[PDB]
Design a protein around this ligand. Sequence first.
Ligand SMILES: *[C@@H]1O[C@H](CO)[C@@H](O[C@@H]2O[C@H](CO)[C@@H](O[C@@H]3O[C@H](CO)[C@@H](O)[C@H](O)[C@@H]3O)[C@H](O)[C@H]2NC(C)=O)[C@H](O)[C@H]1NC(C)=O
Ligand SMILES: *[C@@H]1O[C@H](CO)[C@@H](O[C@@H]2O[C@H](CO)[C@@H](O[C@@H]3O[C@H](CO)[C@@H](O)[C@H](O)[C@@H]3O)[C@H](O)[C@H]2NC(C)=O)[C@H](O)[C@H]1NC(C)=O
Ligand SMILES: *[C@@H]1O[C@H](CO)[C@@H](O[C@@H]2O[C@H](CO)[C@@H](O)[C@H](O)[C@H]2NC(C)=O)[C@H](O)[C@H]1NC(C)=O
Ligand SMILES: *[C@@H]1O[C@H](CO)[C@@H](O[C@@H]2O[C@H](CO)[C@@H](O)[C@H](O)[C@H]2NC(C)=O)[C@H](O)[C@H]1NC(C)=O
Ligand SMILES: *[C@@H]1O[C@H](CO)[C@@H](O[C@@H]2O[C@H](CO)[C@@H](O)[C@H](O)[C@H]2NC(C)=O)[C@H](O)[C@H]1NC(C)=O
Ligand SMILES: *[C@@H]1O[C@H](CO)[C@@H](O[C@@H]2O[C@H](CO)[C@@H](O)[C@H](O)[C@H]2NC(C)=O)[C@H](O)[C@H]1NC(C)=O
Ligand SMILES: *[C@@H]1O[C@H](CO)[C@@H](O)[C@H](O)[C@H]1NC(C)=O
Ligand SMILES: *[C@@H]1O[C@H](CO)[C@@H](O)[C@H](O)[C@H]1NC(C)=O
Ligand SMILES: *[C@@H]1O[C@H](CO)[C@@H](O)[C@H](O)[C@H]1NC(C)=O
Ligand SMILES: *[C@@H]1O[C@H](CO)[C@@H](O)[C@H](O)[C@H]1NC(C)=O
Ligand SMILES: [Ca+2]
Ligand SMILES: [Ca+2]
Ligand SMILES: [Cl-]
Ligand SMILES: [Cl-]
Ligand SMILES: [Zn+2]
Ligand SMILES: [Zn+2]
Ligand SMILES: [Zn+2]
Ligand SMILES: [Zn+2]
Lengths: 677, 677
Amino acid sequence: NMKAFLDELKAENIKKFLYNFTQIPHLAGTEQNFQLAKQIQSQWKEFGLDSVELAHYDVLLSYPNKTHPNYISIINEDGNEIFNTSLFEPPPPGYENVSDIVPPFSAFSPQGMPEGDLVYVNYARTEDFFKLERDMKINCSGKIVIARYGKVFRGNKVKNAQLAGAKGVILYSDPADYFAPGVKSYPDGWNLPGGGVQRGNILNLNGAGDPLTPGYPANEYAYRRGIAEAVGLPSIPVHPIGYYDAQKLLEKMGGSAPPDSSWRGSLKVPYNVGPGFVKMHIHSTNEVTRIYNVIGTLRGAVEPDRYVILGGHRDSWVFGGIDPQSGAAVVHEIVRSFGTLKKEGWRPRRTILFASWDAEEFGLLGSTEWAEENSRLLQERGVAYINADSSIEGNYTLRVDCTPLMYSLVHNLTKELKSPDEGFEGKSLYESWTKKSPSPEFSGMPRISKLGSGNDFEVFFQRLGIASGRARYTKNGYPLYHSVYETYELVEKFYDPMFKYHLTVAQVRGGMVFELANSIVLPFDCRDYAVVLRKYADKIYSISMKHPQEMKTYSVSFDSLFSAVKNFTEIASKFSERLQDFDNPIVLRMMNDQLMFLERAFIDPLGLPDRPFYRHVIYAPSSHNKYAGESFPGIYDALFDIESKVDPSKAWGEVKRQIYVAAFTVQAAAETLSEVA
Amino acid sequence: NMKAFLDELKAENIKKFLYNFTQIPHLAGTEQNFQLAKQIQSQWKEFGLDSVELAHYDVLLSYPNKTHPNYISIINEDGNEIFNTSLFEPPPPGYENVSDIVPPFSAFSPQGMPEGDLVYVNYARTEDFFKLERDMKINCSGKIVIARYGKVFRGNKVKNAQLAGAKGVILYSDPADYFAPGVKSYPDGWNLPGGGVQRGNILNLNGAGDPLTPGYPANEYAYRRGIAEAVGLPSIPVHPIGYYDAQKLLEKMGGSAPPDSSWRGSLKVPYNVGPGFVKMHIHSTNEVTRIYNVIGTLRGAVEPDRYVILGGHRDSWVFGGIDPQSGAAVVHEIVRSFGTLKKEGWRPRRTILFASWDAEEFGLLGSTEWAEENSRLLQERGVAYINADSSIEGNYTLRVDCTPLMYSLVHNLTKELKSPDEGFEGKSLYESWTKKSPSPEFSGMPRISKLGSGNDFEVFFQRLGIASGRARYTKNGYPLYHSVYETYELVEKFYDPMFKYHLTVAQVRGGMVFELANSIVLPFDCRDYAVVLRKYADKIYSISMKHPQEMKTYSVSFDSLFSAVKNFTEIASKFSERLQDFDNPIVLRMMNDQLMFLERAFIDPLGLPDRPFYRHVIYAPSSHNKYAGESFPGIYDALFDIESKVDPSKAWGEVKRQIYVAAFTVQAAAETLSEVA
Ligand SMILES: *[C@@H]1O[C@H](CO)[C@@H](O[C@@H]2O[C@H](CO)[C@@H](O[C@@H]3O[C@H](CO)[C@@H](O)[C@H](O)[C@@H]3O)[C@H](O)[C@H]2NC(C)=O)[C@H](O)[C@H]1NC(C)=O
Ligand SMILES: *[C@@H]1O[C@H](CO)[C@@H](O[C@@H]2O[C@H](CO)[C@@H](O[C@@H]3O[C@H](CO)[C@@H](O)[C@H](O)[C@@H]3O)[C@H](O)[C@H]2NC(C)=O)[C@H](O)[C@H]1NC(C)=O
Ligand SMILES: *[C@@H]1O[C@H](CO)[C@@H](O[C@@H]2O[C@H](CO)[C@@H](O)[C@H](O)[C@H]2NC(C)=O)[C@H](O)[C@H]1NC(C)=O
Ligand SMILES: *[C@@H]1O[C@H](CO)[C@@H](O[C@@H]2O[C@H](CO)[C@@H](O)[C@H](O)[C@H]2NC(C)=O)[C@H](O)[C@H]1NC(C)=O
Ligand SMILES: *[C@@H]1O[C@H](CO)[C@@H](O[C@@H]2O[C@H](CO)[C@@H](O)[C@H](O)[C@H]2NC(C)=O)[C@H](O)[C@H]1NC(C)=O
Ligand SMILES: *[C@@H]1O[C@H](CO)[C@@H](O[C@@H]2O[C@H](CO)[C@@H](O)[C@H](O)[C@H]2NC(C)=O)[C@H](O)[C@H]1NC(C)=O
Ligand SMILES: *[C@@H]1O[C@H](CO)[C@@H](O)[C@H](O)[C@H]1NC(C)=O
Ligand SMILES: *[C@@H]1O[C@H](CO)[C@@H](O)[C@H](O)[C@H]1NC(C)=O
Ligand SMILES: *[C@@H]1O[C@H](CO)[C@@H](O)[C@H](O)[C@H]1NC(C)=O
Ligand SMILES: *[C@@H]1O[C@H](CO)[C@@H](O)[C@H](O)[C@H]1NC(C)=O
Ligand SMILES: [Ca+2]
Ligand SMILES: [Ca+2]
Ligand SMILES: [Cl-]
Ligand SMILES: [Cl-]
Ligand SMILES: [Zn+2]
Ligand SMILES: [Zn+2]
Ligand SMILES: [Zn+2]
Ligand SMILES: [Zn+2]
């Protein structure tokens, strides 16, 4: 039983595994990450899994030239290089003989050497570009931003720079965003030093996976596009720097002043938007490189053709002390603990798949390619996907993002768990979590957020429509994210010395997987979807109601969507009444298939407009505001900035079309829960 | 049991129903076709079905103006109208007071009145246009074809006329194709009179359904495209005529002579290709019009969430004596006969749905819109679709088109059936059928053809991947197709006076539905798919091998596809070994779900290139040669006329890409039949 599974999970094992995974870099495509997969594969066999295989793919990765390094430069009238930005970050104490620490870089930047003049675009948001462009008539055709990391995914920032004429992008981490007041820089606290740099890719893949093989696995015989026709590649060069090097670049800045205090950071500098009072040197290659996923299987006893997936990435930028090895060490113990039960002759009712994804930091490629190869199995047999990236990004409370179908599983599960929090000894995890992080949407309940994008759950949820969730410990990003300073020491000393937060996360993830793989009726409550569908309908109605005149002229009705939502509510009601009153494997299967296929019902096979790989009509990143935008993304995007569009009847036509699509889809989902005949 | 079901089917009932359905026209969108649906709905209730509902949709139909009629004209230098083509066909004996016989027309032709000069393009094929264009340097920018009906679907002919610059299309039925030697015209034989005209739509929908709502059901709140953005509408006017009126138009024809005897018909005329030695008058409107499908349900006893569908259209051009009421009368008796068993307390193991589709003659709209609304139910619960259009187009033997998954069901089923043929009394239907129509592909077995397109099975098979078949009696089209002369009398006197062919077809369709709805293991044999996948791979390899040089230069390998096919063969083998050795409802369900989802595995969610609604990678009409082209249509189309392409490496790149897509898909389908964990 469940208590058995949980009591076998130990914090010391997690510590032991974390240390084991974090002593060298495990960058996607390198021999070191191959050896770590081989090790995971042995260990998962030893732990008891029925099978453990490597699944490999040949995907487009990106690396800096080991002999013509990347850097930015200040240049005078006569073309001399005054300031040079750092080539490496200062390694942390005791890691000076680290072999193969890849230097800071923006994965997938084209090579270039553009000269030109700075322009500070704040966070390089849509909002921020509407500030320069719309109000202050600033124009960047030929100019170079400079932008601070934060708020939005970094690929949107480069996309936004592209759209707006820019010819280079410089990315830096400002202390306002990544320097917690009152705590010391690493190694003496958990803050970002001035020499630290956030790595990361700057792709805009919109769920496509490997840029060369959209739709199909990058296997041994795959036909690859040319780099010219590739999906999501930037056209302008990009490089990240720490705040010491950004000081130098930003201090001599002139032109217009900042519009307000929200456009100024905490460096002792004017934060002058420019233009004028820079030369980039990049040099990174793209190359097809083999990646390795590890897939463990624990065959179910009664329903072996029904899959519950616990999955997380293994690849790191450098040591990945938090991101992802704090997740992977939790997955390792969970596997050990399941295999322990298995060894005592137990099996789960459904099959559990365990995955160690590769090349996640390069655009979710391991998970995506694997899903593309097995989409047929996943879509007819996939019960649920629990992600397992970073277990901690803080030590305050639990963060859960999941489909509404899993709200009660998560509420119930955490009432049976002991809080690890200071001043909540004896109290439950439900208790601490809901005291520390209450629901804004009412009432005496914890906040659970929407699943968005940008981790490995993406392909499962947003393309395939498999019910997904994630859980981790969070703050009230985290400063050392994607720098060399992200180490085991960072976690043992400053984040979780007992490893009690790690263990709590393991119990939430492990217990979710347990409940999903073992409970006789799937632990989904479709009435929860009904409740949020109403909220989301109200929300989107409100955004439209900021244009009352246009709604009258073009006859923009939301009646169909509210009608669909009401029907969903009634049918889901009648359906849960039936789920309680019934005995008989076939009736059981049928009702579970209905529960399982419900999330699937929200997938439109045509996808969203210009994003064929985002097929979920309810959730699914907005094309503009990515995780930051709203649900019913098709309607939200049709409405976004609609007052600016040239042909209003055409633009309002498309709002109506998206109302239709959403209403139809909600009604169709509902009807999967009607009696079957 | 089955013999019970079959013995209850009676020929007299079929006769009785056919007469009942054929006394007035039942054109899509008219009150008469509404009343016929209401009647079917009552009767299906009376017969015993658990439910029978109307499902309606508002779709784009097309009608001639009842007061400004359509016609073609010959015109002199001074603009006078010498020859006028007929306004109606001469009604058959006893039907002179037929109310609301719609006159001959080409459904969905735009209105126009173009003047210009004839050009005879034979059957207006791709092949035939390569004759004029490539060899004889004939050029039609501004000219009017004239073309004979035959060989290809009539919409391809108008598409081909469009592509080639033409400004009108005239369609006529030549006696060479529609006049069987030695038999008299209707009413004294079954031949086409000179006054008879083939109606039909000329859409190129490529599976889209309602031209205004591609992807989504045309329901009460649907957003409709503008006619300008509509899918598959022709741009040039089109009108059909009988051969008496075509004589007049073709006799004064000059310019170049016919290239051979395959370009000349059997009218006493030169068959001069033109140009020169005509004015069209059209006038038809398009309008959104309500259609009504009738859906009957016979709830299954053990697996009510698994659907077997028997479906056929009800709408006719005029009386529909063969097309479709000879099908629908068979469906009616089948339903009666199932409901009879039901009334004696029996139920099928799986649910059976019975459908009377509407607006099929207007581009498969009833079936398609219904499938678009219920795609989610169909794709997870759909076992099989048996079509039920025209039961007879001849009286020689059985024609069966079906997925390879149904070969053995059909072989087995016909060995248990009595042949209705002259000189085969006592012998089985398998016996007559295979003597009369042997397999070319070896050996002592009957020919079974590929399912193509152009009837209501299309959306189920080609878009949704639901295993489908059809069966009918055929000749060694049929002359009166889509004319007013297609009557009950045509069938009772000349085609099937006993109604013994009708009854044989009812037993084949009914017994297929019976076996599929009742057998404990689904009656699919996946090894049959393995066999034809090899044939299809060999075939497509051969077409490519006509370009050996280019295969060397661009490294065009079919290794991946043969490898995929071999794996399919091995896995399907191992899978049938398991299907025989096993006991336990859950294991039964699982193995059936594997069998059921196998056809589904051949669906690519991205569709074929520029045809998003044809998603089956194996079958599925070619973009060029439609039912006439080959399997692996994506590869076939990439290769078609490839020597003419401007950029050979780009064109050969796309052949390779389609090899990849096909190989991947075959491998992925196979793997659904591997052990599940
Ligand atoms: C939510 O569920 C209800 C069913 O409880 C759906 O109501 C349906 O609404 C349409 C009108 O929007 C009705 O259409 C009407 O059909 C009659 C013939 O039946 C026709 O003569 C009228 O002109 C009209 O077109 C439909 O029958 C009605 N069904 C009911 C009330 O039982 C509603 O559409 C559902 N919402 C969505 C978004 O699907
Ligand atoms: C049909 O099934 C067979 C399996 O029986 C598939 O064979 C597989 O073929 C590829 C090469 O095309 C092998 O890849 C190799 O992997 C090794 C590591 O395992 C690597 O070091 C090599 O460089 C190479 O990339 C694969 O392992 C092999 N599996 C076998 C023989 O067991 C074949 O691909 C299937 N056909 C299709 C179209 O899927
Ligand atoms: C992480 O732990 C594993 C195993 O617990 C270590 O791998 C083993 O190392 C010993 C000593 O070299 C060998 O006997 C085995 O060959 C290894 N087993 C494997 C690879 O599965 C591994 O070295 C540890 N890593 C670190 C850096 O401490
Ligand atoms: C979470 O727990 C609640 C309360 O225990 C469960 O809801 C009850 O479920 C039982 C068992 O089927 C019913 O008999 C009760 O009537 C339910 N009570 C309420 C308040 O609804 C709920 O099923 C659990 N959710 C899960 C496991 O998904
Ligand atoms: C086809 O058969 C049906 C019923 O067997 C006939 O419909 C019935 O006609 C009688 C006489 O008008 C009425 O009592 C009923 O109202 C009808 N029932 C219905 C519509 O379900 C129908 O008229 C026949 N059609 C023809 C042309 O013979
Ligand atoms: C069609 O009939 C053949 C021959 O009767 C069936 O094949 C046999 O099926 C039985 C029953 O499971 C097996 O024990 C035999 O070994 C099979 N014989 C052969 C020659 O394969 C076949 O299953 C039937 N096909 C259907 C109903 O789909
Ligand atoms: C920056 O790098 C270049 C290339 O090595 C060099 O010429 C230049 O002087 C450098 N600047 C400094 C301060 O070293
Ligand atoms: C861990 O816990 C203490 C308790 O408040 C807190 O002060 C400290 O900020 C936490 N560490 C991190 C990295 O957030
Ligand atoms: C053809 O129809 C037009 C329109 O009614 C008429 O003017 C013309 O003379 C007709 N030709 C004949 C032969 O009646
Ligand atoms: C029906 O049967 C006879 C037998 O050969 C044949 O001569 C006649 O052509 C058939 N009728 C039709 C319409 O094919
Ligand atoms: Ca791919
Ligand atoms: Ca439609
Ligand atoms: Cl996570
Ligand atoms: Cl048919
Ligand atoms: Zn991560
Ligand atoms: Zn990361
Ligand atoms: Zn028909
Ligand atoms: Zn027809």
